[PDB]
Amino acid sequence: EKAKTALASSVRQTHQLMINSKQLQANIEVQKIALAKAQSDYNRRVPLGN
Amino acid sequence: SFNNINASISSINAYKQAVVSAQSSLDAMEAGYSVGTRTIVDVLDATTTL
Numbered sequence A: 001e002k003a004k005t006a007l008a009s010s011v012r013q014t015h016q017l018m019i020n021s022k023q024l025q026a027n028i029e030v031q032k033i034a035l036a037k038a039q040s041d042y043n044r045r046v047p048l049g050n
Numbered sequence B: 001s002f003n004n005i006n007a008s009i010s011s012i013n014a015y016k017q018a019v020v021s022a023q024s025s026l027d028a029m030e031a032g033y034s035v036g037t038r039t040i041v042d043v044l045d046a047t048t049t050l
Helices: A002-049 B002-035 B041-049
Strands: none
Touching: A002 B002, B002 B041
16 A cells, blocks of 8 residues: 555656646747747837938 | 028028928838837827928
């Protein structure tokens, strides 16, 4: 029974890492959006300078 | 009368400079609108000043 409980705990823990992956993917999405905003802003400003 | 003629000359020079400044501002405002950084109220206000 002790061994079975240990296996259950390990299987549960491995799932916590498989979800942290999705969390970090969402963070990447946020960063992509910010970069897109900056790029759009600069492309808007470039012609004026010329 | 002589002094008045001289004053008129100076005023003409001042007004020409003002016209050039207003034209530059209008061009800036129009370019900003073309790239999408400004509304059309700004364009109309610049036109009025010119």
